[PDB]
Structure 1
Amino acid sequence: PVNPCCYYPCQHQGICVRFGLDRYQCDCTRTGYSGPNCTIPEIWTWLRTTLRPSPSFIHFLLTHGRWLWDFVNATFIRDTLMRLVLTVRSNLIPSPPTYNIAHDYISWESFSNVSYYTRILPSVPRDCPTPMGTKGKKQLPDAEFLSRRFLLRRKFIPDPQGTNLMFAFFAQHFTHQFFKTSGKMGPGFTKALGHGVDLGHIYGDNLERQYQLRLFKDGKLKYQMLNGEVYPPSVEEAPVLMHYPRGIPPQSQMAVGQEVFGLLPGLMLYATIWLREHNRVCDLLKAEHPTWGDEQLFQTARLILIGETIKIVIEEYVQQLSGYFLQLKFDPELLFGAQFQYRNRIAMEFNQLYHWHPLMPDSFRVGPQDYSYEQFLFNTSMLVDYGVEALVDAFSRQPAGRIGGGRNIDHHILHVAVDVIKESRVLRLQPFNEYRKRFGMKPYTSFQELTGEKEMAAELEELYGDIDALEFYPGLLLEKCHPNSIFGESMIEMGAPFSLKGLLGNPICSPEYWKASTFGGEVGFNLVKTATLKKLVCLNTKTCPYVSFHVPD
């Protein structure tokens, strides 16, 4: 008897439950539909769906008519729309979280064990006829072949939106505080127990590590002086585990919150900027609160930096990424009248979607000098040799690669995409089309509709055999991009919900925490409300270089 849930019979988030030896029932509770497979719409459900413009038309509206948007952005309409965006996008993510790699049903273990990444759609049943369920071949295309054929970069394709490396390293630094897959436990497990913006990549993901990194004086983080400049301390003064190639002297190993940041100067660059921001904030707090001890100074600075991070990510990072003329706004109060849960659980699908390796260039240009991957990766003297300002200027000037479209991952890191595809199969992620529906989009009827071209589509069709067998990650990177965009609609329609839910679901955005006293008063609250990338760098450097998420003109 073939497992009926392998046919993915339940639609619109209805829940498929096996009954008896060969039957099944769909739980349509609060889905807005009824019927055996939750396909019969209620009045409002129908109106909403038949009158709702497509993601492509909305994307069009949001990226045209700057004159009208400039007007709108200066009115209450800016808040009305930002609220709509926030609520409509986040409503797609279940909270409290539902499934994980071990349970394809709600359970107390899935709810309480935070070492697990959560998941939005259950896994493909292990007893299905094919790897993807019912469609496709008995064996999926070879991961290595799939990557070399469709993901490997031939000629560098720059992001048409003007995104640069300053943005690419920001994204890598930022996401690594919540994507920390455990090697020991395996796929489906994380070590970033904070499941969000807790800044564990600065303060450490565990208490013992945090303590080794702290100076325990004035609430500050340990540091060292080099060429009269402030940098993270060496592992000798802050005995913390760091992932460095064997043979590298401890004196040349910098100690920071995230163990893998010694991998790239671009990562240590941000680690340095934030470390300096932390100590700088500590100084501001101390002047305002001379009676405070080291602990409160440290904890309050952390909250301020968390706020500064969310602010910059929404108003500058996501702004650059979206390309929207609507001025995004970070304002927790926009949700104080709505039903919203201030909690977040990182999804394995979100982890998959954020592998933006295509952003990395062919080489790294620092002034007249061009540096190869071998001169850049694990280079422990570049940051100190050039200093923060020089690297920020350089990264802000060099363009990053386009993410969507295919064939744009540098050969030096193509192996990551290969492992991502392999991980996807161990996690038994459902097919791309099931995720399209889960996120409110119509499934693609053919590979041609997906890619927008004919040659790659024909080859994919031969390899997968059926569009309904196309996998999650390949689908995301091979989907045709929006006009002049960094990526396709699925990346936005699927990524926006996870991202927004992750940003606003932070406890500091709750009515309980979002108050001046939480940040030490008006001074600290204002630091959060008015934070910018430019201020983050220039208030912590001797000179002010060109700083931005987009290349200059």
Structure 2
Amino acid sequence: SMKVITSLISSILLKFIHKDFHEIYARMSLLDRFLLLIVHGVDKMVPWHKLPVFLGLTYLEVRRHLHQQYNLLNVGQTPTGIRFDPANYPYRTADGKFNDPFNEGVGSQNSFFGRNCPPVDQKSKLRRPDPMVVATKLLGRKKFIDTGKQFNMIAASWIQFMIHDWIDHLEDTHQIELVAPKEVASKCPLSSFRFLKTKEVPTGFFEIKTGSQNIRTPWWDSSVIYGSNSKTLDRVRTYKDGKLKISEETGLLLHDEDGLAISGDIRNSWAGVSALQALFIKEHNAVCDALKDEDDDLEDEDLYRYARLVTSAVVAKIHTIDWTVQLLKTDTLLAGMRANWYGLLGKKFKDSFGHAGSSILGGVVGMKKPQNHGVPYSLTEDFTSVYRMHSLLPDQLHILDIDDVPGTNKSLPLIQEISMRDLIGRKGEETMSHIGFTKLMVSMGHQASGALELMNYPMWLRDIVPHDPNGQARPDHVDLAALEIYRDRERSVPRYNEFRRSMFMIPITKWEDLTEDEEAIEVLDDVYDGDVEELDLLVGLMAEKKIKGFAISETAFYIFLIMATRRLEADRFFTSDFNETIYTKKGLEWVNTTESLKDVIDRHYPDMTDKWMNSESAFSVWDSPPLTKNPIPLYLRIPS
């Protein structure tokens, strides 16, 4: 046969593949071996992010395909259940069941986290090197480093607002204690701290024998405002006109008898997230008003269901084509992220002529069927690790004088600095009640986030009161930087270099491959006793030299590449059921005409961005100078 001869040639070409990929290679199809040869070839020459946009996009299409085929690992028995008719569930269910037309429990509350990379058992190394040493020497903020004008505090609030929709790990009842070693104890805000073990649930399989459970629905269903089950949904519903609870007077969240905010998920939250919850409750309630006017025969439950479909799709769209484009501020990713939604052919073509039929040309949104690449949808252990972005948070929020006349580029002066401790949890709700929605939002818009670099982890997070899932305070404080290191190890996520190999990225051989910062190299060498194989994932992701324009590492980005696409393409409500029958005509129109966070702010606060936002995106620092558009066609642009 020709297939056997070509496979022999593929075995010959194995001489051009990095030795660490020989294993994953044997598991690949013939065409995919050729594709890996091409991807790996580019990696060794001019890298994709230096290519003309159209070639960068071609590279990313091929790499993403490889990850879809080889970096999606199921965990646990698939919760298939008895066969059901998806037409019986033309709405987002309270616990995320009945979305995958073939598996009732996929994407539901308490489903298993899947994986992208094979697990690496680290139970004998949970404290090697010591996580409080790692936190002290490599993570704790020395001098604040910001993100320039690229990514403001609304953008930092937004990604946490998404984490509250996406991922949270079920805990066991067993307590763990970490103790600060003598060497760093005087630099540790806590000399020791206690927390709960992650719940390890047996799977019944050989390759992956235990898994974690996700207590948030992994569907992108806005469970951050709707809850992840019927009980928590019931708490937010008014049962009038489809609506959710909010203060009519202040536009802020309501609070329960303990002063805790009433929303979908408020765990370990802060004022910035509360602001976005309130904004999107206003969005949901505005959709209810529009649909109830159109049709007086719709009852509360009908209104709620349609408005949840519209609101959750608006959020997903804004994240995809506005937020991500600020995180990944390059021409290639502008083109790429917009293509996820609208296809390479573009919005104007799609809006005029409809979906072209392939994800490449028309976007994953509106595809005829959901796509899971043969692996039941989940968010993964690896996804959790790469979204650990706590260094985005500042030490203080800079509250501006919104009563002052805006200056050049709509700049405003500082009126007060507020410690982040005063803006988190219950205390933060009280502080926000005095500041108000407008002042907080404008101040967040004008303030840069922290950068994802070493030695930039807020020290206030090294002694925080953590919460139970309902937002209730725990008596045992945690050092979050040390805890994150422990969790990645506890949950068997590969450390940095093995993570790279698993994602067919060339591994580092020395610290100089990771970063040009000579003092950071010395710290890494100290903490890890020279061993790049012991380098923690979180540390590597913060340390890695950034592609120009990227706020995250390339290693994190490849997980974003595949998993962001997956959140849309696997979900019926973004694919087979993204249509006017399911959304209503007006509901679909609402999604299709909303392109940005600015559009939503302008809907509810009609004068805010005119007065105070000079940037194009509400996620960029608001007093940015005007920019003249690049006259070179997008798909032809060459990165400098």
Q: TM-score category by the smaller chain?
A: 0.7 to 0.9
The 8 Å contact of residues 160 and 484 in structure 1, kept in 2 or not, is answered as no
Match of 1:197 among 220, 226, 249: 220
**Does residue 366 of structure 1 match 2:366?**
no
Q: CA deviation at 1:364?
A: 0.6
Give matches, 1:264-275, under 5 Å. 264-275=270-281
Structure 2 CA distance for aligned equivalents of residues 538 and 544 of structure 1: 7
Query: Counterpart of 1:269 in 2: which secondary structure?
Result: helix
Which runs of 5 or more structure 1 residues have no equivalent in the other structure? 1-8, 16-26, 34-40, 63-68, 70-76, 133-138, 237-249
Structure 1 CA distance for aligned equivalents of residues 59 and 579 of structure 2: 23
Structure 1 CA distance for aligned equivalents of residues 324 and 277 of structure 2: 21
Report the AA paired with residue 98 of structure 1. L
Structure 2 CA distance for aligned equivalents of residues 28 and 526 of structure 1: 48
Structure 1 CA distance for aligned equivalents of residues 513 and 572 of structure 2: 41
Q: CA deviation at 1:462?
A: 4.2
Aligned to 2:50: 60
Structure 1 CA distance for aligned equivalents of residues 514 and 245 of structure 2: 51
Structure 2 CA distance for aligned equivalents of residues 537 and 351 of structure 1: 29
Alignment CA distance shift 1:56-1:258 (3 Å): farther
The 8 Å contact of residues 90 and 498 in structure 1, kept in 2 or not, is answered as no
Match of 1:387 among 433, 436, 442: 436
Query: Counterpart of 1:231 in 2: which secondary structure?
Result: coil
Match of 1:222 among 245, 250, 262: 245
Report the AA paired with residue 158 of structure 1. D
Aligned to 1:410: 458
Alignment CA distance shift 1:278-1:484 (3 Å): closer
Q: CA deviation at 1:232?
A: 2.8
Query: Counterpart of 1:224 in 2: which secondary structure?
Result: coil
**Does residue 48 of structure 1 match 2:48?**
no
Query: Counterpart of 1:291 in 2: which secondary structure?
Result: coil
Alignment CA distance shift 1:541-1:409 (3 Å): same
Aligned to 1:256: 263
Structure 1 CA distance for aligned equivalents of residues 566 and 459 of structure 2: 33
The 8 Å contact of residues 163 and 549 in structure 1, kept in 2 or not, is answered as yes
The 8 Å contact of residues 198 and 306 in structure 1, kept in 2 or not, is answered as yes
Aligned to 1:38: none
The 8 Å contact of residues 122 and 489 in structure 2, kept in 1 or not, is answered as no
Alignment CA distance shift 1:304-1:467 (3 Å): same
Q: Deviations over 1:254-305 (max 9, x none)?
A: 31111326x4111111111011111111001111122111111100100101
Aligned to 1:525: 588
**Does residue 396 of structure 1 match 2:402?**
no
Aligned to 2:372: 341
Structure 1 CA distance for aligned equivalents of residues 59 and 574 of structure 2: 17
The 8 Å contact of residues 117 and 503 in structure 2, kept in 1 or not, is answered as no
Alignment CA distance shift 1:14-1:217 (3 Å): farther
**Does residue 316 of structure 1 match 2:322?**
yes
Q: After superposing the two structures, state which structure 1 stretch, 287-296 or 461-470, moved more.
A: 461-470
Alignment CA distance shift 1:340-1:86 (3 Å): farther
Aligned to 1:353: 386
Report the AA paired with residue 391 of structure 2. P
Aligned to 2:557: 492
Match of 1:143 among 131, 141, 159: 131
Q: CA deviation at 1:478?
A: 1.6
Aligned to 1:119: 115
The 8 Å contact of residues 150 and 406 in structure 1, kept in 2 or not, is answered as yes
Q: CA deviation at 1:361?
A: 1.1
Q: CA deviation at 1:351?
A: 0.8
Relative to the length of structure 2, the TM-score reads: 0.68
Report the AA paired with residue 57 of structure 1. P
Structure 2 CA distance for aligned equivalents of residues 507 and 84 of structure 1: 28
Structure 2 CA distance for aligned equivalents of residues 13 and 533 of structure 1: 45
Q: Deviations over 1:340-397 (max 9, x none)?
A: 3286311111111111111111211111121112322232233333332221111000
Structure 1 CA distance for aligned equivalents of residues 300 and 79 of structure 2: 37
Relative to the length of structure 1, the TM-score reads: 0.78
Give matches, 1:228-239, under 5 Å. 228-236=249-257
Q: Deviations over 1:154-203 (max 9, x none)?
A: 11111145211010001111111112222347425344352131111101
Structure 2 CA distance for aligned equivalents of residues 12 and 152 of structure 1: 35
The 8 Å contact of residues 393 and 458 in structure 2, kept in 1 or not, is answered as yes
Alignment CA distance shift 1:413-1:13 (3 Å): farther
Which runs of 5 or more structure 2 residues have no equivalent in the other structure? 1-17, 81-102, 174-196, 199-210, 343-358, 401-414, 463-478, 625-640
The 8 Å contact of residues 433 and 470 in structure 1, kept in 2 or not, is answered as yes
Structure 1 CA distance for aligned equivalents of residues 368 and 114 of structure 2: 28
Report the AA paired with residue 255 of structure 2. S
Q: Deviations over 1:36-66 (max 9, x none)?
A: xxxxx95x3465246435697322347xxxx
Query: Counterpart of 1:423 in 2: which secondary structure?
Result: helix
Q: CA deviation at 1:338?
A: 9.8
Query: Counterpart of 2:500 in 1: which secondary structure?
Result: helix
Q: After superposing the two structures, state which structure 1 stretch, 390-399 or 215-224, moved more.
A: 215-224
Alignment CA distance shift 1:344-1:401 (3 Å): same
Structure 1 CA distance for aligned equivalents of residues 304 and 79 of structure 2: 33
**Does residue 302 of structure 1 match 2:366?**
no
Alignment CA distance shift 1:52-1:223 (3 Å): same
Query: Counterpart of 1:369 in 2: which secondary structure?
Result: strand
Matched residue pairs, number? 478
Alignment CA distance shift 1:159-1:524 (3 Å): same
Aligned to 2:347: none
Structure 1 CA distance for aligned equivalents of residues 68 and 506 of structure 2: 18
Q: CA deviation at 1:339?
A: 9.0
The 8 Å contact of residues 48 and 59 in structure 2, kept in 1 or not, is answered as no
Structure 1 CA distance for aligned equivalents of residues 281 and 443 of structure 2: 20
